[PDB]
């Protein structure tokens, strides 16, 4: 009555010790993002997470399975769709966006890690395309307000007087709940690199190529100011570096990281949109099997 | 010296501190021996022997009916109770000879006590008489291994000294207790081959072992130190050749195509035992280990003792283990039962505790990318293990999954605890079936 | 009198969109209000009966190298007869405009049909399954277009049914969002029939 | 399987030719209904925008020279009631081709947008009656776009979230107003 | 009338000339009674000890390549892991209680289910020949003793007792040749273990 | 209207399958493997393009003395029928089975819904020649690009057991392509 198989150890860390380390790793970025926004922004993040998690729980009872809720996939997706919203929306619009984030993009395509794209970007693209006027608000200090990415083209608001570059790190800049606190998001990526959750080969190449496009473009009081602006600090760290979307190969990663700034910065500058860290990762995530096929590691004994 | 390594790998936990600094006590046998003819790779020898004969140490038990088989020898003097068939832990019904110990320890005399005069063809023959297996890993007879067909000229002989595996101290002792003898045999292994210079390849983690060795290598030319970095799987034959002489092994190949022939140190000490001390394989070191055992131990077993009595000699189970292990923790097969006879291909025994041995029913693969990072061969396993389940064999062959060494490293890092290797093993058997 | 089953064979099994997946190209382009598609399916129905009645009188005299060029020309003549009806008799001036009217000569269904069936089917044996096929066509629209319209504006047949603020969803009516409704709805057609 | 090109070519030419003849006969018969129905749809949109005029005649001597491509004069018998002005200001995503009705009394009676490339479902469209109906009875003076509450006499409420579109439409009408004062008041 | 001629002559400047390029270039370059699968294993949980708890794939084809040759004490029964339900899309086969069982009236005879099993427990049989053997054993029966209570013990009375002799003792197993059999059916009481099973449609 | 404005205009921001739904009927068909699926678009870089030259000959002066556009719907499409039975002869010239692996769509290459829709599109703006030809090569590269991208998704979807029973094969492909349209929706301000 003795258990048997062929390797006998398989010990390092469970996917709960991956995910849960990410759910603890963004906590200084969220606690730094929340106290300007008060309780007002807390309702969208708790109700979007709990709606996302119980929406996966309805699909475990469809075709039968053991519940993966305890692997903590379902919490990370919820905690990232809530980062994309400005705080003044009614809650049901995110709750239907979390139901799209699970039930279509993840559970129709398979289980955890089989989907070809990030759900939070797909639910966000569905959200911003369906009710943009609900998404227009930039609630901080009461009034609707300008954000730096619109004024940097100069094409839009008459009212512009840009915040000083130190003020963005504190989080005083308006816009969405996570992305403004770029220094504590650096504190969370500095924690995540210490656990060897993720290689440098995506964030370093992606931040480097949008810095080259913003430097030859010339657009800012400094070229450096664009890198902390917007969601791009989330998109080099939490978004594109997601296991399931990301390519497996060591060279496949850096082609995906160089080519993400080929498409993001063009929507930032030549494009009419305020930002490109979203609609850019969905195209480069759809490119991945054509990357992963032709880019393979060299075999240890190739002929010739 | 500087610590060379191959490009990719893991750092499995180092369990050796329980066992590393203890004497090799002899185990005198108590219960009856059984000898299974099947222990060498390839087809078993039929025994010559039949029931009720007197038998002795160093008798051949059975002529090797094929090009790749090697002579058996009894561990002990005794009598033939029965040419009984018996299970191995694989569950093949191997032929075997029961030998009750008489307790008397008769041995046939044989001595030589020089190598230097001898013709090299007399060495390959006396090594076919000795019947010696290559001791670690997969278990070739060494007499085919010393004889390439001529066109693949040697450049060198590294030993494969690097005992990468957790909890396996069995080679570290042979280095402390008898370093001349292993360099003596090396000088021998080098008499059969000139042009090829010799190298030791010990890991840095036994720094005390090479620092004992370092005085012995000063007075002679072709042997020299090559310390290596601690990384599983250094003991695989295809990676150590890239590590030292820096040719890459050809795919599908043999070590003679790389011009060098790895050996275990245990084989070295036993080739020295055959050409000089005149005796074959009565014995090998087990390393029994694990916290469920009442003490860590390092027995010299007499071949063909039942494993149950051997672990009871080691102190027995503080609690019942959930996974007794032939061989090392990774590569080795697990026991069907404790009852099985010990065999020359055993190099150690483990008795894992609940604190490790509990795994989980697996989650779906997350596409983490760690398994491509940790394969030494830069094979891309998740497509291969996914290819056996649909049996889409052209994807197995374009990915070159016939190549893989079954190191077990690709299962070891997975957060999902997908266990890939059994799908790799079923696909490697199906490619032998239909190609 | 086999018309009753030949129709249920054309709509349960030969149906253009839920099964056969020819002819999606109007079926997603026209859906943005359901009337426009009910007129797209009715105009598709009268051209679908009218192709097979003319082509099966023509059927015997075609060499096998040119099985398609006569068929695309007679559908071009039939297509023009209706587009000239569209400019004159009954424009209604929404189905005249937001339909992509020329696209019925290059509808994927009818030429993917006439080679498959009306060539080897009888001239009479063509009027019944063409009427049924066209009927399935509107049906394979109207169940979809009521769903895409009701989750859009909420104005089924153009008419309000809810407070305008609760239903400002529109992405369905947009171009990505109709495909998701087909991937819900045809999966609902298969799961009952599984 | 005889496939000679002479037999094929004569049968081919025949079938294509009979289809072309029949289409030509249909073409000669259909011209008059198309002309009345086209005239009726232009006149119907025109009567809805400028209800005091019954008859409309294009001022064919004046080719537009700025963003205006043509003008239609509105009469009720001999009296001039106004003009319909086609304009295409640059919006955020492209030109907004629209007709603007202007009375001889100097009020904008309304607008109708014809092109569908302006703001593809983003915000609320300018074609919505809640926005487009606000231009009725405004003075023919420069209208201004506001952030906030409407005053009436000179303010146009921007579509929420689509302030760029409202600025573009209001710019196009104001340029049409400027065209009215320089080319249209008194002929 | 004068404008009617223009569509047909203007069509004729593309008119013949595409069929001038076409076929001038196209001429340049133009049985028995049906078989039915049957399991030859009876090992419901209680009737055979498994020697060991099994970490693994939960597919039967994977379980061959582990020490101990899969979970059963018998080397030759099915494991019950159910990899053969994946290949029979017709779904005659239901696993229950750790064994496969074909449903007797759905199976096509399509025969891929034999090749997928490492243990080769399936044998195609004629549907008519209702007496059928039900183990795969290749062993002395004292090793069956501690293992499978249902098993054939190579006990060998059955070759003495069949008049038609549709039986032969190949490789320590019964091996019926079904066409010789008359289905006389005395053999079902002859086995103490009931390793034979008549399908009993009477 | 300039050539770099035009060639992006079918490649990305207003791709024929990903917003307009021109071309959707083949797009569920030979997506099955990328090594076959690129050759349907390599067939499309001729058909779409030589018909754009031949429809310009109708728009040059063969229509012009009639001074009526109405005949064109019965016209250049017969020339599109001429170009496709020419290319079944050269698919068989060395390597037939290249596009024969799903050859039920081989006829629909006469009658792809996109292939008229560059041309009626070309004939509903009265473009000067070379802008129409770079519009043809950009619609063919965008059709080839979306078909190869769905081919890289459906190689993965055929080797994934976890999808719900009813959904297997085709309906999940409608879930992708519209999600693939969700990817292209953010290009709208670039052109
Ligand atoms: C993954 C792998 C790891 C191995 N590790 C060792 C080892 O740590 N020690 C060892 O003596 N042999 C090891 N071997 C066995 C060798 O392949 C080869 O058999 C050995 O280097 C020489 O011993 P031999 O005389 O049996 O050939 C390993 C083999 C493989 C495939
Ligand atoms: C650091 C980290 C970040 C992740 N971020 C996301 C994410 O933003 N969205 C997501 O869907 N999955 C994310 N995942 C993986 C997630 O559990 C699941 O694989 C998704 O369904 C992606 O396919 C992340 C995983 C890790 C380790
Ligand atoms: S076992 Fe095979 S897949 Fe795993 S690391 Fe070794 S070679 Fe790579
Ligand atoms: S098997 Fe494990 S290591 Fe390999 S890709 Fe899947 S999750 Fe990552
Ligand atoms: S004896 Fe019969 S039931 Fe038991 S394992 Fe073997 S075949 Fe299966
Ligand atoms: S084929 Fe044989 S071993 Fe495989 S699952 Fe079916 S009965 Fe079990
Ligand atoms: S695979 Fe064929 S023979 Fe075997 S059970 Fe299924 S249908 Fe019957
Ligand atoms: S009689 Fe019964 S036990 Fe004896 S061999 Fe025949 S079937 Fe097996
Ligand atoms: S059924 Fe009757 S005839 Fe057939 S084998 Fe058994 S005993 Fe013999
Ligand atoms: Fe189509």
Q: For residue C23, what are its two tokens?
A: 């002819």
For residue B350, how many other CB atoms are within 10 A of its CB? Answer: 30
List Cβ neighbours of F95 (8 Å cut-off, separation of 6 or more): none
Within the 109-138 window of chain F, which residues sit less than 8 Å (CB to CB) from chain E? none
DSSP B283-320: EEE--B--TTBSS----EEETT-BHHHHHHHTT-BSS-
Considering the domain architecture, whether residues D133 and D175 belong to the same structural domain is answered as yes
CA–CA distance, D125 with C159 (Å, rounded to integer): 18
Resolution in A: 4.3
Indicate if ligand 6 lies below 6 Å from the C-beta of E74: no
Question: What method was applied to determine this entry?
Answer: cryo-EM
CA–CA distance, E63 with E53 (Å, rounded to integer): 12
Taking the CA of residue F67 and the nearest CA in chain A, the distance in Å comes to 41
Domain limits of chain B? 16-20+112-275, 370-433
CA–CA distance, B287 with B343 (Å, rounded to integer): 13
HSE of F74, CA atoms in CB hemisphere, 13 A: 34
Q: For residue B432, what are its two tokens?
A: 């032998």
Q: How far is the CA of E162 from the centre of ligand 9 (A)?
A: 5
CA–CA distance, D134 with D141 (Å, rounded to integer): 15
D35: phi then psi, degrees, rounded to nearest 5:
-65, -45
What residues of E are in contact with residue A3 (Cβ under 8 Å)?
52-55
Any idea of the CA torsion for C157, C161, C162, C165, to the nearest 10 degrees? 30
Q: How far is the CA of A76 from the centre of ligand 2 (A)?
A: 6
Beta strands B197-199 and B156-158: pairing type?
A: parallel
Indicate if ligand 6 lies below 6 Å from the C-beta of E100: yes
Number of helices (H), then strands (E), in chain B: 14, 12
CA–CA distance, F70 with F50 (Å, rounded to integer): 22
Is D4 in CB contact (< 8 Å) with chain E? Answer: yes
Q: For residue E159, what are its two tokens?
A: 């070759």
- Find the chain B residues whose C-beta atoms sit closer than 8 A to any C-beta of E: 89-91, 333-337, 359, 389, 419, 422-423, 425-426, 429
Q: For residue E187, what are its two tokens?
A: 């053999």
B389 vs E66: CB contact, 8 Å cut-off? no
Considering the domain architecture, whether residues D17 and D88 belong to the same structural domain is answered as no
What residues of C are in contact with residue F78 (Cβ under 8 Å)?
69, 72-73, 76
Q: Which helix (H) or strand (E) holds D73?
A: strand D71-76
Give A6's strand partners. none
Q: What single-letter DSSP state applies at residue E198?
A: E
Give B197's strand partners. B156
For residue B320, how many other CB atoms are within 10 A of its CB? Answer: 10
Indicate if ligand 5 lies below 6 Å from the C-beta of E193: no
Apex B159 CA angle, B155 and B165, nearest 5? 140
Burial class (CB in 10 A: 0-12, 13-18, 19+), B337: middle
Least CB-CB distance to D16: which of F68, F78, F189? F78
Considering the domain architecture, whether residues D97 and D44 belong to the same structural domain is answered as no
Q: Which of A112, A109, A54 is nearest to A78 (CA)?
A: A54
C18: phi then psi, degrees, rounded to nearest 5:
-70, -30
**What's the number of domains chain D is made of?**
2
What residues of A are in contact with residue F180 (Cβ under 8 Å)?
286
- Ligand positioned closest to the Cα atom of B157: 1
For each of the domains in chain A, give its residue range(s) and CATH number, in order of start: 15-158+167-293 (1.10.3430)
Beta strands E131-133 and B54-55: pairing type?
A: unpaired
User: Is the distance from CB of B1 to CB of B226 less than 8 angstroms?
Assistant: yes
Indicate if ligand 9 lies below 6 Å from the C-beta of E196: no
Q: For residue B190, what are its two tokens?
A: 């080098």
User: Is the distance from CB of D118 to CB of C171 less than 8 angstroms?
Assistant: no
User: Is the distance from CB of C158 to CB of C94 less than 8 angstroms?
Assistant: no
Domain limits of chain C? 3-137
For residue B130, how many other CB atoms are within 10 A of its CB? Answer: 24
Q: Which helix (H) or strand (E) holds B374?
A: helix B370-374
User: Is the distance from CB of B185 to CB of B272 less than 8 angstroms?
Assistant: yes
CA–CA distance, D127 with D145 (Å, rounded to integer): 17
Taking the CA of residue A73 and the nearest CA in chain D, the distance in Å comes to 33
* Alpha carbon distance, N-terminus to C-terminus of chain B: 47
Handedness of CA B295, B297, B299, B303 (dihedral sign): positive
CA–CA distance, F168 with B227 (Å, rounded to integer): 56
Burial class (CB in 10 A: 0-12, 13-18, 19+), B116: exposed
Q: Give the position of tokens 């990301």.
A: A246
DSSP chain A: ---B-SS----S--HHHHHHHHHHHTHHHHHHHHTTTTTTTHHHHHHHHHHHHHHHHHHHTTTT----GGGTHHHHHHHHHHHHS-S-S-THHHHHHHHHHHHTTTTSS-STT--SS-HHHHHHHHHHHH-HHHH----TTSS----HHHHHH-SS-S---PPPHHHHHHT-S-S-TTTT-HHHHHHHHHHHHHTT-S-TTTHHHHHHHHHHHHHHH--SSSSTHHHHSTTHHHIIIIITT-TTTS-SSHHHHHHHHHHHHHHHHHHHTTSSSS--SSTTHHHHHHTHHHHHHH--PPPTT---
Closest alpha carbon within chain A to C151: A130
User: Is the distance from CB of C31 to CB of C148 less than 8 angstroms?
Assistant: yes
For domain B16-20+112-275, give its CATH number from 3.30.1370.100, 3.40.50.11540, 3.10.110.10, 1.10.3720.10.
3.40.50.11540
In ligand 4, the atom with minimum distance to the C-alpha of B372 is: 4
CA–CA distance, C109 with C16 (Å, rounded to integer): 7
A6 vs E53: CB contact, 8 Å cut-off? no
Cα–Cα distances in angstroms (integers) from residue B394 to residues B310, B410, B427, B434, F150, in the given order: 47, 22, 11, 11, 22
**Three-class DSSP category at E167:** strand
Q: Cite the DSSP H helix spans in chain C.
A: 3-12, 24-29, 34-58, 69-86, 111-113, 124-150, 177-193
Q: How far is the CA of A82 from the centre of ligand 4 (A)?
A: 28
Q: Which of C39, C24, C35, C15 is nearest to C178 (CA)?
A: C24
Cα–Cα distances in angstroms (integers) from residue E127 to residues A88, D162, E32, in the given order: 72, 76, 11
What residues of C are in contact with residue E19 (Cβ under 8 Å)?
66
Q: Which helix (H) or strand (E) holds B367?
A: none
Q: Cite the DSSP H helix spans in F58-123.
A: 76-91, 97-100, 105-108, 113-122
CA–CA distance, A65 with B259 (Å, rounded to integer): 54
Indicate if ligand 9 lies below 6 Å from the C-beta of E166: yes
Q: For residue D121, what are its two tokens?
A: 């479902």
CA–CA distance, D114 with D127 (Å, rounded to integer): 9
List Cβ neighbours of F120 (8 Å cut-off, separation of 6 or more): C102
Q: How far is the CA of B424 from the centre of ligand 3 (A)?
A: 9
CA–CA distance, A264 with A253 (Å, rounded to integer): 17
HSE of B403, CA atoms in CB hemisphere, 13 A: 23
User: Is the distance from CB of C20 to CB of C55 less than 8 angstroms?
Assistant: no
**Three-class DSSP category at B15:** coil
Indicate if ligand 5 lies below 6 Å from the C-beta of E80: no
Burial class (CB in 10 A: 0-12, 13-18, 19+), E140: exposed
Q: For residue F18, what are its two tokens?
A: 């990903």
In ligand 3, the atom with minimum distance to the C-alpha of B379 is: 8
Chain-centre distance for alpha carbon B326: 11
Considering the domain architecture, whether residues D96 and D132 belong to the same structural domain is answered as yes
CA–CA distance, E113 with B370 (Å, rounded to integer): 36
Is C66 in CB contact (< 8 Å) with chain E? Answer: yes
Shortest-distance Cα residue to atom 4 of ligand 3: B410
For residue A20, how many other CB atoms are within 10 A of its CB? Answer: 16
Q: Which domain holds residue D34?
A: 1-49
């Amino acid at each position: 009555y003795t258990v048997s198989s062929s390797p006998h150890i398989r010990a390092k860390d469970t996917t709960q010790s991956i995910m849960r380390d990410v759910v603890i790793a963004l906590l200084p970025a969220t606690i730094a993002g929340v106290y300007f926004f008060k309780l007002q922004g807390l309702l969208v993040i708790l109700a979007s997470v709990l709606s996302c998690v119980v929406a996966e729980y309805i699909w475990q009872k469809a075709s039968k399975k053991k519940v993966t809720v305890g692997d903590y996939s379902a919490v990370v997706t919820g905690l990232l769709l809530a980062f994309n919203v400005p705080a003044s929306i009614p809650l049901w619009i995110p709750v239907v966006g979390g139901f799209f984030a699970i039930i279509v993009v993840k559970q129709f395509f398979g289980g955890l890690g089989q989907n070809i794209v990030n759900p939070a970007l797909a639910a966000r693209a569905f959200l911003l395309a369906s009710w943009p006027v609900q998404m227009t608000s930039w609630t901080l200090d009461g009034v609707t307000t300008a954000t730096p990415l619109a004024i940097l083209k100069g094409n839009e608001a008459t009212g512009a007087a840009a915040p000083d570059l130190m003020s963005v790190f504190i989080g005083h800049v308006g816009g969405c709940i996570g992305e403004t606190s770029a220094l504590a998001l650096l504190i969370g990526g500095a924690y995540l690199f210490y656990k060897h959750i993720i290689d440098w080969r995506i964030p370093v190449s992606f931040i480097g190529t949008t810095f080259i496009f913003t430097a030859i473009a010339g657009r800012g009081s400094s070229p450096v100011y664009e890198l902390f602006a917007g969601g791009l600090m989330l998109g080099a760290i939490f978004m594109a570096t997601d296991y399931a979307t990301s390519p497996i190969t060591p060279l496949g990663r850096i082609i995906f990281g160089v080519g993400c700034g080929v498409i993001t910065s063009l929507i930032r500058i030549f494009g009419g949109y305020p930002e490109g860290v979203s609609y850019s990762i969905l195209v480069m995530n759809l490119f991945v099997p054509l990357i992963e096929r032709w880019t393979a590691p060299k075999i240890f004994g190739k002929v010739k | 010296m500087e610590l060379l390594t191959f490009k990719n790998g893991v750092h499995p936990p180092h369990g050796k501190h329980y066992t590393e600094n203890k004497p090799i006590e002899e185990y005198l046998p108590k219960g009856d021996i059984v000898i299974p003819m099947s222990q060498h790779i390839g087809a078993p020898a039929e025994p010559i022997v039949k029931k009720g004969d007197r038998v002795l140490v160093g008798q051949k038990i059975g002529e090797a009916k094929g090009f790749v088989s090697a002579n058996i020898h009894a561990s002990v003097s005794g009598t033939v109770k029965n040419v009984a068939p018996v299970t191995l832990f694989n569950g093949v019904k191997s032929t075997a000879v029961i030998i009750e110990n008489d307790g008397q320890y008769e041995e046939i005399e044989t001595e030589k006590r020089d190598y230097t005069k001898l013709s090299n063809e007399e060495i390959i023959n006396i090594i076919k008489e000795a019947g010696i297996v290559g001791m670690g890993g997969a278990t070739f007879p060494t007499h085919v291994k010393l004889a390439p067909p001529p066109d693949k000229n040697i450049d060198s002989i590294v030993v494969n000294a690097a005992e990468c595996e957790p909890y396996l101290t069995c080679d570290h002792r042979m280095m402390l207790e008898k370093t001349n003898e292993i360099v003596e045999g090396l000088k021998i292994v080098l008499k059969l081959f000139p042009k090829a210079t010799g190298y030791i390849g010990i890991e840095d983690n036994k720094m005390n072992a090479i620092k004992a060795m370092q005085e012995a290598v000063k007075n002679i030319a072709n042997i020299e130190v090559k310390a290596v970095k601690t990384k599983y799987p250094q003991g695989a034959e295809k990676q150590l050749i890239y590590a030292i002489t820096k040719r890459e092994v050809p795919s599908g190949g043999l070590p003679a195509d790389a011009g060098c022939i790895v050996q275990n140190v245990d084989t070295i000490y036993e080739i020295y035992n055959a050409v000089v001390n005149g005796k074959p394989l009565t014995s090998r070191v087990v390393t029994v280990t694990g916290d469920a055992i009442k003490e860590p131990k390092n027995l010299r077993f007499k071949i063909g003792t039942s494993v149950r009595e051997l672990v009871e000699a080691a102190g027995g189970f503080a609690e019942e283990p959930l996974k007794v292990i032939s061989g090392g923790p990774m590569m080795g097969m697990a026991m069907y039962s404790l009852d099985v006879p010990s065999t020359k291909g055993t190099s150690g025994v483990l008795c894992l505790t609940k604190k490790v041995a509990e795994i989980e029913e697996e989650s779906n693969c997350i596409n983490c990318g760690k398994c491509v990072q940790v394969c030494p061969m830069n094979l891309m396993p998740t497509k291969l293990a996914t290819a056996s389940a649909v049996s889409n064999l052209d994807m197995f062959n374009e990915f070159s999954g016939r190549d893989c060494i079954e190191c077990g490293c690709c299962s070891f890092v997975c957060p999902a605890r997908r266990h890939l290797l059994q799908r790799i093993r079923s696909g490697k058997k199906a490619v032998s079936k239909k190609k | 009198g086999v018309v009753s089953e030949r129709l249920y064979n054309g709509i349960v099994k030969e149906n253009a969109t839920f099964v056969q997946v020819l002819g999606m190209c109007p079926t997603l382009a026209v859906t943005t209000s359901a009337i426009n598609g009910i007129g797209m399916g009715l105009s598709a129905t009268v051209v679908l009966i009218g192709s097979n009645v003319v082509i099966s009188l023509l059927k015997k005299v075609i060499p096998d190298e040119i099985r398609i060029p006569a068929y695309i020309t007679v559908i071009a003549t039939l297509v023009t007869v209706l587009q000239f009806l569209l400019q004159a008799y009954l424009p209604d001036l929404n189905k005249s405009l937001g339909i992509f009217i020329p696209l019925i000569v290059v509808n994927c269904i009818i030429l993917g049909r006439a080679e498959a069936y009306a060539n080897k089917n009888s001239v009479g044996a063509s009027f019944f399954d063409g009427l049924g096929m066209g009927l399935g066509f509107t049906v394979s629209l109207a169940a979809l277009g009521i769903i895409r319209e009701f989750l859009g504006t909420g104005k089924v047949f153009g008419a309000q049914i809810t407070p305008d603020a609760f239903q400002p969803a529109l992405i369905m009516i947009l171009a990505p969002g109709g495909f998701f409704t087909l991937g819900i709805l045809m999966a609902i057609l298969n799961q009952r029939k599984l | 399987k005889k496939v000679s090109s002479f037999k094929l070519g004569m049968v081919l030419l025949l079938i294509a030719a009979v289809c072309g003849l029949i289409l030509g006969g249909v073409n000669q018969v259909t011209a008059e209904p198309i002309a009345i129905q086209n005239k009726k749809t232009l006149d119907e949109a025109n009567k809805a925008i400028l209800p005091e005029a019954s008859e409309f005649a294009e001022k064919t001597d004046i080719k537009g020279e700025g963003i205006v491509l043509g003008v239609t004069e509105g009469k009720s018998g001999s009296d001039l009631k106004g003009y319909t002005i086609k304009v295409a200001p640059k919006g955020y995503a492209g030109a907004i081709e629209m007709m603007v009705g202007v009375s001889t009394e100097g009020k904008v009676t309304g607008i109708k947008i014809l092109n569908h490339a302006e703001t593809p479902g983003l915000g609320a469209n300018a074609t919505d009656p809640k926005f487009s109906g606000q231009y009725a009875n405004k003075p023919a003076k420069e209208l201004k776009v506001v952030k906030g509450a409407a005053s009436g006499e000179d303010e146009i409420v921007a579509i929420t979230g689509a302030t760029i579109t409202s600025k573009a439409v209001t710019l196009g009408v104001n340029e049409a107003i400027k065209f009215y004062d320089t080319k249209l008041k008194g002929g | 009338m004068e404008g009617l001629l223009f569509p047909v002559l203007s069509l004729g400047g593309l008119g013949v000339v595409f069929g001038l390029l076409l076929g001038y270039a196209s001429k340049k370059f133009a049985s028995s009674e049906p078989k039915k699968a049957y399991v030859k294993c009876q090992g419901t949980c209680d009737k055979a000890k498994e020697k060991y708890e099994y970490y693994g794939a939960m597919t039967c084809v994977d379980a061959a390549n582990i020490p101990g040759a899969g979970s059963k004490t018998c080397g030759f029964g099915c494991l019950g892991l159910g990899s053969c339900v994946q290949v029979c899309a017709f779904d005659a086969i239901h696993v229950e209680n750790g064994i496969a069982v074909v449903d007797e009236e759905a199976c096509t005879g399509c025969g891929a289910c034999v090749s997928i099993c490492p243990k080769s427990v399936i044998e195609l049989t004629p549907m008519s020949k209702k007496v059928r053997i039900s183990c795969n054993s290749h062993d002395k029966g004292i090793e069956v003793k501690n293992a499978c209570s249902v098993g054939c013990l190579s006990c060998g009375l059955c070759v003495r007792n069949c008049p038609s002799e549709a039986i032969t003792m190949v490789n320590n197993l019964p091996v019926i040749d079904y066409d010789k059999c008359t289905q006389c059916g005395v053999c079902v009481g002859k086995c103490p273990t009931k390793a034979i099973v008549n399908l009993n449609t009477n | 209207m300039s050539i770099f404005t035009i060639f992006i205009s079918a490649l990305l921001v207003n791709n024929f399958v990903l917003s307009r739904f021109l071309g959707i009927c083949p797009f569920l068909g030979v997506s099955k493997k990328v090594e076959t699926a690129t050759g349907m678009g390599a067939a499309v870089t001729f058909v779409m393009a030589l018909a754009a030259i031949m429809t310009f000959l109708v728009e040059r002066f063969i229509l012009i003395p009639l001074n009526i556009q109405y005949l064109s719907t019965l016209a250049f499409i017969l020339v599109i029928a001429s170009l496709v039975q020419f290319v079944e002869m050269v698919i068989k010239k060395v390597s037939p089975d290249l596009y024969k692996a799903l050859g039920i769509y081989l006829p629909l290459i006469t009658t792809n819904c996109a292939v008229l829709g560059m041309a009626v599109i070309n004939s509903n703006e009265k473009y000067n020649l070379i802008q129409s030809i770079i519009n043809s090569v950009g619609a063919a590269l965008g059709f080839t690009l979306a078909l190869v991208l769905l081919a890289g998704i459906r190689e993965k979807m055929e080797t994934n057991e976890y999808i719900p029973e009813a959904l297997k094969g085709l309906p999940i492909t409608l879930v992708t392509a519209g999600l693939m349209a969700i990817a292209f929706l953010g290009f709208q301000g670039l052109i």
